[PDB]
Amino acid sequence: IVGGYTCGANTVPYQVSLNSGYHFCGGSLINSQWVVSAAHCYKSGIQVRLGEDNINVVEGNEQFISASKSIVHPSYNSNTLNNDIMLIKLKSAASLNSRVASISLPTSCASAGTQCLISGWGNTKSSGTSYPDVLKCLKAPILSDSSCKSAYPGQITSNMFCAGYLEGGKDSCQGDSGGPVVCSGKLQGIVSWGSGCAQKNKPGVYTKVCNYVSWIKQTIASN
């Protein structure tokens, strides 16, 4: 996250770190046994890390659980990033408490102008690289579909939304992918793609979770 603030340890209890020997993407806990992330974050041998603040120090609230199965959306297109969503089932159920909790799925799609919270351990500079050890947060509004399409002509589908600031300076960045966009207590987006980070007229692009509720519930119910 560029231009954000330090969340504070365990203040975003549904935030997960996906680890394959190092942190590579964020995720969101949706129930005690399932995580939602970005399909572009798919790999085999994922370890889900819950209750993290500093990803380099065992502080005492972590739960490390291996994934038992991963399911990329049936229509994921890696060239266009359309349907950039995946489900990961944990080998065992996480223990839920104040610091490890699930985020609720939306019953309605959020509108342009709604303020949301975006979080992750990604790069913090738009120029060069500096990866934080502790969870970073950014409050950003959902942009109008019109704004979004004008920033990225021919690339936004109905399963994507833009969030951020057209003036630049504040955005998600590398390593934030798969992380949550929460608006009014519901998971509305997944950090998916962008052009650079925090550049003027190039806000981050997010997977629109409200379009996938049916797929998520059906999938959880049978696996």
Name the minimum Å distance from CB 59 to Ca ion.
5
Q: Which CB atom, from 59 or from 167, has the smaller least distance to Ca ion?
A: 59
Size of the chain, expressed as the number of residues it contains = 223
Q: Which of 1, 12, 27, 52 binds Ca ion (CB under 5 A)?
A: 52
- Active-site residue flag, 195: no
Beta-sheet strand order (sheet of 115-120): 5-6, 136-141, 115-120, 180-183, 186-193, 204-208, 160-163
- Active-site residue flag, 23: no
Single out the segment in contact with Ca ion by CB under 5 A; choices: 16-24, 57-65, 137-145, 196-204.
57-65
Backbone φ/ψ region at 30: left (φ over 0), alpha (ψ -120 to 50), beta: alpha
Name the minimum Å distance from CB 74 to Ca ion.
34
175 is in an annotated binding site: yes
**CA–CA separation, 187 and 208 (whole Å):** 9
- Active-site residue flag, 84: yes
**CA–CA separation, 130 and 181 (whole Å):** 22
Q: Which residues bind Ca ion (CB under 5 A)?
A: 52, 54, 59
Residue ranges of the annotated binding site are 52, 54, 57, 62, 171-172, 174-175, 177
Q: Which residues are designated catalytic?
A: 40, 84, 177
